[PDB]
Design an enzyme around this catalytic site. Structure first.
Site, PDB file in Angstrom:
ATOM      1  N   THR B  12       0.800  -1.217   0.000  1.00 29.95           N
ATOM      2  CA  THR B  12       0.000   0.000   0.000  1.00 29.95           C
ATOM      3  C   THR B  12       0.835   1.270   0.000  1.00 29.95           C
ATOM      4  OG1 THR B  12      -1.885  -1.035   1.117  1.00 29.95           O
ATOM      5  CG2 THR B  12      -1.702   1.345   1.295  1.00 29.95           C
ATOM      6  N   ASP B  52       1.432  -6.935  -4.258  1.00 30.91           N
ATOM      7  CA  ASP B  52       0.437  -6.686  -3.226  1.00 30.91           C
ATOM      8  C   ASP B  52       0.808  -7.831  -2.294  1.00 30.91           C
ATOM      9  OD1 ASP B  52      -2.545  -5.870  -5.214  1.00 30.91           O
ATOM     10  OD2 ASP B  52      -0.776  -4.705  -4.639  1.00 30.91           O
ATOM     11  N   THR B  84       0.663  -4.595   4.126  1.00 32.60           N
ATOM     12  CA  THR B  84       0.274  -5.007   5.470  1.00 32.60           C
ATOM     13  C   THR B  84      -0.432  -6.350   5.591  1.00 32.60           C
ATOM     14  OG1 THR B  84      -1.799  -3.773   5.319  1.00 32.60           O
ATOM     15  CG2 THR B  84       0.109  -2.636   6.274  1.00 32.60           C
ATOM     16  N   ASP B  85      -1.178  -6.746   4.562  1.00 30.31           N
ATOM     17  CA  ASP B  85      -1.929  -8.000   4.618  1.00 30.31           C
ATOM     18  C   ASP B  85      -1.150  -9.221   5.105  1.00 30.31           C
ATOM     19  OD1 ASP B  85      -4.225  -6.698   3.927  1.00 30.31           O
ATOM     20  OD2 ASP B  85      -4.567  -7.731   2.034  1.00 30.31           O
ATOM     21  N   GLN B 265      -7.149 -20.680  18.686  1.00 29.82           N
ATOM     22  CA  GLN B 265      -7.737 -19.771  17.716  1.00 29.82           C
ATOM     23  C   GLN B 265      -7.951 -18.402  18.372  1.00 29.82           C
ATOM     24  OE1 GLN B 265     -12.558 -20.713  17.934  1.00 29.82           O
ATOM     25  NE2 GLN B 265     -11.247 -22.244  16.922  1.00 29.82           N
ATOM     26  N   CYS B 266      -7.695 -18.314  19.678  1.00 32.12           N
ATOM     27  CA  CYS B 266      -7.842 -17.052  20.415  1.00 32.12           C
ATOM     28  C   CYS B 266      -6.686 -16.111  20.073  1.00 32.12           C
ATOM     29  CB  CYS B 266      -7.831 -17.304  21.930  1.00 32.12           C
ATOM     30  SG  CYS B 266      -9.119 -18.435  22.495  1.00 32.12           S
TER      31      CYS B 266
HETATM   32  N1  LIG Z   1      -2.340 -14.369  14.440  1.00 27.72           N
HETATM   33  C1  LIG Z   1      -2.854 -15.372  15.142  1.00 27.72           C
HETATM   34  O1  LIG Z   1      -2.363 -16.522  15.110  1.00 27.72           O
HETATM   35  C2  LIG Z   1      -4.127 -15.028  16.003  1.00 27.72           C
HETATM   36  C3  LIG Z   1      -5.105 -16.189  16.324  1.00 27.72           C
HETATM   37  N2  LIG Z   1      -4.467 -17.157  17.162  1.00 27.72           N
HETATM   38  C4  LIG Z   1      -5.564 -16.979  15.067  1.00 27.72           C
HETATM   39  O2  LIG Z   1      -5.636 -18.243  15.129  1.00 27.72           O
HETATM   40  O3  LIG Z   1      -5.820 -16.283  14.060  1.00 27.72           O
HETATM   41  N1  LIG Z   2     -13.859 -14.236  16.344  1.00 24.83           N
HETATM   42  C1  LIG Z   2     -13.447 -13.815  15.157  1.00 24.83           C
HETATM   43  O1  LIG Z   2     -14.138 -13.962  14.128  1.00 24.83           O
HETATM   44  C2  LIG Z   2     -12.027 -13.133  15.121  1.00 24.83           C
HETATM   45  C3  LIG Z   2     -11.252 -13.182  13.781  1.00 24.83           C
HETATM   46  N2  LIG Z   2     -11.957 -12.443  12.772  1.00 24.83           N
HETATM   47  C4  LIG Z   2     -11.103 -14.618  13.212  1.00 24.83           C
HETATM   48  O2  LIG Z   2     -11.291 -14.818  11.973  1.00 24.83           O
HETATM   49  O3  LIG Z   2     -10.813 -15.497  14.055  1.00 24.83           O
END
Ligand SMILES: NC(=O)C[C@H](N)C(=O)O
Ligand SMILES: NC(=O)C[C@H](N)C(=O)O
Ligand SMILES: NC(=O)C[C@H](N)C(=O)O
Ligand SMILES: NC(=O)C[C@H](N)C(=O)O
Lengths: 324, 324, 331, 329
Positions: B12, B52, B84-85, B265-266
């Protein structure tokens, strides 16, 4: 004197491994829960008690119907639940409970009430007090002194007491010496008789976009078990320009599969060379994966054609996304 | 006068309202602040073609690593301009590929093109240059919105904000205000000696997200052939449904020599797994981000190591990407 | 923060000085102790044993005076060898001043001293009293940091770095210029915050005696006359809550007033009125001493500590800018 | 916050009062901006700079300076579409608060801003804060005195400089920002402040002897007694928590003595955030300042004492929300 119904579905809060009857046994040894200031409440222990990590979409259905059965006899409802998928449950209930006219608060604890330093008693007491004295007629999630809109939440801090966040929306209420209602814009709210929409099993896939992802992933889902596909793309909704990959997505949509584009970022709004959109992909704005997945289970379970569902996924049905 | 090398890979930062060769440099030429006597000398190498970051593939990490290798001896620091992506993926990959790093490597960019109004490009670049020359930290870092983060601990967390990046499980290494301050953040394991740059080769890796209703078919699919490793984004501290079928599929994957790693996933938190998943051959990824885990796998799978050795290395702190 | 052994059952001494935590609808003798006896969590095997000494009379912390800091310090000294740690139950209004005062008064501290309390009475609904006290006792017994600390809302802060920043929140306290020493979640985690200066041997209490100190806030329109007023008679030191990094009006009248004050032997210390930041030093030529990033709480108590000792003005001025207990960040 | 039309080219007036932004290691600032392309893009509004003579460090400001600025705004009100006040950071929040009370019937945006680092120094935040302020003034014309800093627009009389060394120098502890800037400029759902109608009216603010007392352990009644000496028409008490102070009998008497003499005594919290909720003090004539900042309280007193109002009216007005500086019960 208000009367609150408590659905004890399971979760960390009542564990020792879960055991029938010990949650209640504990509350009995805590007088604060019987204070004149506290509303009357009844606890219904589910059978069997479940760790929320084992929850299936049908379990959201059981809870929704449980609320329906008790609706007229209580002033509010608190759902005790495990933290792992609490946000998914709160989100599902928001869609399944149309024209909600009483508060439904989901909560739980990071540490079982049986263990030292537990946050169970305080989150439960607060949910009861709030449901009775500061009623907001939406499915909400209460945790660590804040009340969040259910379909805007996500478990963001696995090890902290401030386990949940609402990345794209401020909380609805905050608790301190006093309880304060924030000026957060109310969600579209229907008035009338409560309508509870049942749901049926729906095969949905969740694809995360990352460097080196191949078209095979999409192609596999096109195999046979899939009615919808959620894409967790970069930033405001970008993905590699790989022509092979794009073609699989297009083919998926031509087969009636609902493909929704979300951002993999914690906060942000998807704003989609407009390839993806040309490939039939629908933008999910700032919806969480939790809200998108449950919104799909809800819409796919009704008598709606593929095009109607695709249009509804981008509309704000219960306050789960910010329009335009 | 320190001398800094700037690799302009695209992003960008140098786009117009689409990327265009020479525009970034033509713009900086009209910004006197960059040539002030307090600034270090710097050279900009424009990549061909500019990309990109959403189009980045693992081989692109290799090109950047080899570019740094070629210029290593002739500069005091390195700044990588990037979209940044996937900036966090690149920062993470370089941390593994550049062993015994003895000069600072800072990745940065902007949310708004330097060509557009309100751009954060000039400020992030100016800061990265000044930091690389005056507050050198010999690690691959990511500078954004007045903070320098450990590269393999970062993630793009806010798609629409200027504070686009976060380091959920680790504090920043440095913060800029009226003064630039180095924080007491513990240093990562750092090898001393000659710089070693490890090349990487394409590796098929899958990323599966755990959610209510997920079926064993997904795991079975990746078993088809396109996989040498599988990353699981599980609930909370690493939980998933205990569906026997699902579990057996994971077990077969490991028996076939596939490295299966469990992450949360947190946004923040550490994985801590009777212990079904562990018995199924799954490896705990502690508090690593998906970005660090994916790139760590590309790094380890590219070397000549037994599946056994790779599994053990994944849970070890190689470059400060996880907390032991 | 050290991760102490849990091998043996610890004995913690609780100084119940008063505060919201033990009130009801006003303080009542014995009420807090009875409530704790009725709460099972405080008596589990994983918890340390504790003894409560109820102060007479119980006090709202807003009524505290430096004499009260002295009383608490003496109470700690009197029981030092008999317990493994000390928790001071206190009202929130001046909890940070007490924590700061104790840090300077206690030398050679080899056991934890944790100040805590609550925003809502232990009785009343939604109280944070049980959890703050439960955590304080557990931390005192298992994470024996040898400093005076303040525990509130799942965080342990260095006492002389704290200030009550949010009057209505459960997260009432902050440590604006230093990270927390410990944070509680599913697990208790320690931050690698640098160590404060420590002595060795038996605990020594540095007593204090009345010291007239003025706290002047710099604001638009304040004049030299205003300052000349503080020079009335109740002042041996003057704390200036200046703008940003330590700026104040530079007109000659104001500066002469400050120079006259110091010429009279008054210790003038410059702090920032901002929540966070470090004073960087005009005023210096007028005899004003920079307080770096110290809080008003730490500066006020540090002065009571120093002025109560037989030190000449020059020595006190020098000591004010030095890091004695971890209350300030040196250059 | 209104999303104004971008149809025509706006003209913004910039009052360069002084501050860090234009410092070096007169005319310097204006030449610097002429040399920065961003400020002359077609998407930017036209602007005119009025450099004050002499320029001032904000730490030397007095109430007379707030009046100077207010008169400068009134003088050019009809000729410009918005106003940006370049100011030193040290007392920027006091000026923004003062202007909010002084400017009645304000129908155009007035934004105070500046920088932590001089525009002449590297790493300066001056360029971005000023560029953002000009752009916001032209496109999001909120009719209030606001303060812009570090990608956020705050209600002026709710701000305070909270971080002396950070680029996020300012905070609005008891009210959310009005606007936040990112890829897009987002407006928050913040309740509007009271607004009049018609031509701008500037209420005068004159020097007033006001004492600011900080409550701390050991404070004697002599403090209050000393203020009752002469430099006092009002007294601001920075009390503990939700507004508590020592129940000292002599202390309470000196306070009731002050109010008897016609002195306006206002109780505020010394805490960064929170609302006063007093009882001894109330029965001593002390007025509750709710959740007002010291900055808003000091300037509100200067404003009220300078108007044609008797003591009883001023005391009553201090607890009322006049310009959005406090939250009603
Ligand atoms: N960047 C990360 O890994 C954040 C989160 N733990 C996810 O699973 O997306
Ligand atoms: N809870 C969420 O949806 C957080 C983030 N957008 C993800 O894809 O995990
Ligand atoms: N507690 C503090 O010292 C905060 C702030 N510096 C003040 O002057 O009040
Ligand atoms: N700016 C403020 O008013 C903050 C705090 N209430 C103080 O007394 O300084």
């Amino acid at each position: 004197k208000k009367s609150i119904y408590v659905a004890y579905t399971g979760g960390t809060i009542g564990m020792q491994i879960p055991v029938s009857g010990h949650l209640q046994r504990q509350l009995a040894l805590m007088p604060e829960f019987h204070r004149p200031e506290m509303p009357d409440f009844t606890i219904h222990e589910y059978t069997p008690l479940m760790d929320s990590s084992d929850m299936t979409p049908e379990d959201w259905q059981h809870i929704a119907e449980d609320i329906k059965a008790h609706y007229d006899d209580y002033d509010g409802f608190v759902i005790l639940h495990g933290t792992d998928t609490m946000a998914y449950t709160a989100s599902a209930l928001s869609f399944m409970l149309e024209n909600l006219g009483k508060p439904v608060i989901v909560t739980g604890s990071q540490i079982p009430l049986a263990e030292l330093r537990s946050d169970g008693q305080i989150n439960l007491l607060n949910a009861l007090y709030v449901a009775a004295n500061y009623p907001i007629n939406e499915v909400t999630l209460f945790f660590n002194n804040r009340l969040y809109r259910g379909n805007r939440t996500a478990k963001a801090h696995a090890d902290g007491f401030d386990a949940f966040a609402s990345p794209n929306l401020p909380p609805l209420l905050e608790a301190g010496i006093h309880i304060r209602r924030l000026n957060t814009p109310p969600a579209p709210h229907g008035e009338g008789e409560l309508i509870v929409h049942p749901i049926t099993p729906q095969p949905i896939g969740v694809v995360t976009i990352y460097p080196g992802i191949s078209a095979d992933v999409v192609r596999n889902f096109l195999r046979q078990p899939v009615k919808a596909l959620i894409l967790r793309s970069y930033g405001v909704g970008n993905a590699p320009q790989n022509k092979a990959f794009l073609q699989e997505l297009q083919e998926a949509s031509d087969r009636g599969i609902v493909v929704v584009n979300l951002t993999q970022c914690m906060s942000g709004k998807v704003n989609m060379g407009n390839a993806l959109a040309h490939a039939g992909v629908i933008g999910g704005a700032d919806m969480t994966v939790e809200a998108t997945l449950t919104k799909l289970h809800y819409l796919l379970s009704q008598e709606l054609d593929t095009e109607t569902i695709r249009k509804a996924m981008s509309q704000n049905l219960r306050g789960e996304l910010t329009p335009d």
